[PDB]
Nucleic acid binder design. Structure first.
Length: 19
RNA sequence: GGUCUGGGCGCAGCGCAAGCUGACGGUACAGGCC
């Protein structure tokens, strides 16, 4: 389970796709 | 005044046998230079 790249500053760009 | 990186940590859902994910925490958190 749970293993891609949730890397903080990179995840930011995906977090900013939920919005 | 300004830029770039990104990691280890915890709760829930279903089985003949095994194994996913969570606008879940986290819009958080750490690090160095200029």
């Amino acid at each position: 389970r749970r293993g891609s790249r949730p890397s903080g500053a990179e995840r930011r760009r995906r977090r900013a796709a939920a919005a």
